[PDB]
Amino acid sequence: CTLKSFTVEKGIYQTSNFRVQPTESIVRFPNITNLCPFGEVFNATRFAS
Amino acid sequence: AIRMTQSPGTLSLSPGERATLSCRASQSVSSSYLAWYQQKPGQAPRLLIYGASSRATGIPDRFSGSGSGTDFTLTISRLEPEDFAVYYCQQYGTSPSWTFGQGTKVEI
Ligand SMILES: *[C@@H]1O[C@H](CO)[C@@H](O)[C@H](O)[C@H]1NC(C)=O
């Protein structure tokens, strides 16, 4: 397929690339224990000028 | 632990007058996290004010909230036959640490 031919002559042909695929996914976020106070911004009684 | 107290202990007024209830905090409480509830006997608390100045859905405009720091105020401009029930002030937040007042009773 790389040579686009059904006959292959004697030689060495680079046909593809090899890649070790990942095994699993890792997530590392900071150890945070607070909720963002978005209520007092989006739910304020009076927005500023 | 913040302590929320209410004044007066019992408020006696006639219908059509002006009612003012005060909530005192042992510390400085953010005005964004103060609520006012009205509870008639035999019922669940009804949220009147949140954010210390915003009225819940269906609340008559005769109720108003104000204040900051340690002093917060719930003002009823014109008492009505339905506006005579217990009143609580609550301090809350985005953290699991809330507090309630001891209750102020408005009577005829
Ligand atoms: C994250 O913090 C909590 C305390 O807030 C602690 O109990 C927990 O062990 C911490 N976790 C890590 C991975 O540091």
Curated annotation (Swiss-Prot), chain A:
Glycan attachment residues as annotated in the record: T23, S25, N31, N43
Effect the entry attributes to changing G39H: In strain: Omicron/BA.2.75, Omicron/XBB.1.5, Omicron/EG.5.1
Annotated spans, Disordered: 19-35
Role played: Attaches the virion to the cell membrane by interacting with host receptor, initiating the infection. The major receptor is host ACE2. When S2/S2' has been cleaved, binding to the receptor triggers direct fusion at the cell membrane. When S2/S2' has not been cleaved, binding to the receptor results in internalization of the virus by endocytosis using host TFRC and GRM2 and leading to fusion of the virion membrane with the host endosomal membrane. Alternatively, may use NRP1/NRP2 and integrin as entry receptors.
Assembly mode: Binds to host ACE2. RBD also interacts with the N-linked glycan on 'Asn-90' of ACE2. Cleavage of S generates a polybasic C-terminal sequence on S1 that binds to host Neuropilin-1 (NRP1) and Neuropilin-2 (NRP2) receptors. Interacts with host integrin alpha-5/beta-1 (ITGA5:ITGB1) and with ACE2 in complex with integrin alpha-5/beta-1 (ITGA5:ITGB1). May interact via cytoplasmic c-terminus with M protein. May interact (via N-terminus) with host bilirubin and biliverdin, thereby preventing antibody binding to the SARS-CoV-2 spike NTD via an allosteric mechanism.
Name the record gives this protein: Spike protein S1
Organism of origin: Severe acute respiratory syndrome coronavirus 2
Species classification: Viruses, Riboviria, Orthornavirae, Pisuviricota, Pisoniviricetes
Covered range of the whole protein: 301 to 349 of 1273
